[PDB]
Design a protein around this ligand. Structure first.
Ligand SMILES: [Mg+2]
Ligand SMILES: [Mg+2]
Length: 238
């Protein structure tokens, strides 16, 4: 029957010429290929500036305890400067076709996670992107604050241990779980459907596994090879 699986470019479309994880180029290239969404990772600096980067440390600097001034001139793998979230969102605003899959990274206390989530929602709001921005996090305190602040927004849990029923009760609108969790709990995708929630799986790059997850009926696949997933979905729709 009909596949209902859409493609999320993990860290943007970075496995392509001139691109880099979590970059302006990767966001642009995700849009250029027509992916459903582009995922990116967000930290709050010591001085409350939101920046875009996966790892907790960049070139020996721990992002969450450093000021933005210490970090601002550090370069990505393609020579771009470390993006501010504001810069990321200014570019995303002109890219109309694409959903923004905003991962808030885990912060150092529950209260700091709440602060990072509040400031994230404020930035998304002032940049006029609340309609196109979905939140994901490993951190439960961050997720709960996004749910509280944005009851009509999409919020999915990353960490893998809560059933869809448990997530629905907390006000989540989806799960976004490691593929092995969904292999270990093969009924959770169906339960999400029954519960009116979305299912997302990360980070799936092997073609046999993409097929397995599409067969299971995941709403989204988060991948470092987004064009391969698109090809597979196109061939299957023939
Ligand atoms: Mg079919
Ligand atoms: Mg991420």
């Amino acid at each position: 029957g009909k596949d209902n699986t859409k493609v999320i470019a993990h860290r943007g479309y970075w496995k392509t010429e001139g691109s880099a994880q979590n970059s302006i180029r990767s966001l642009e290239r995700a849009s250029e290929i027509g992916a459903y969404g582009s995922e990116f990772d967000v930290h709050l600096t010591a001085d409350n500036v939101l920046v875009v980067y996966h790892d907790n440390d960049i070139q020996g600097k721990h992002i969450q305890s450093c000021t933005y001034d210490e970090l601002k001139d550090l370069q990505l793998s393609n020579g771009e400067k470390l993006p501010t979230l504001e810069q990321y969102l200014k570019r995303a605003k002109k890219l109309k076709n694409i959903r923004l899959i905003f991962e808030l990274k885990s912060h150092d206390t529950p209260e700091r996670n709440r602060d990072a989530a509040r400031l994230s929602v404020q930035m998304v709001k002032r940049m006029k992107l609340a309609k196109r921005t979905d939140y994901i996090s490993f951190n439960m305190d961050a997720c709960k604050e996004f749910i509280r602040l944005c009851p009509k927004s999409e919020v999915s849990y990353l960490n893998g241990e809560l059933s869809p029923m448990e997530l629905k009760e907390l006000g989540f609108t989806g799960l976004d779980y490691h593929y092995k969790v969904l292999q270990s709990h093969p009924d959770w995708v169906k339960d999400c459907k029954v519960l009116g929630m979305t299912s997302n799986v990360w980070t799936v790059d092997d073609p046999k596994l993409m097929e397995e997850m599409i067969d299971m009926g995941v709403d989204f696949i988060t991948t470092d090879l987004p064009e391969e997933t698109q090809k597979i979905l196109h061939s299957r729709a023939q």
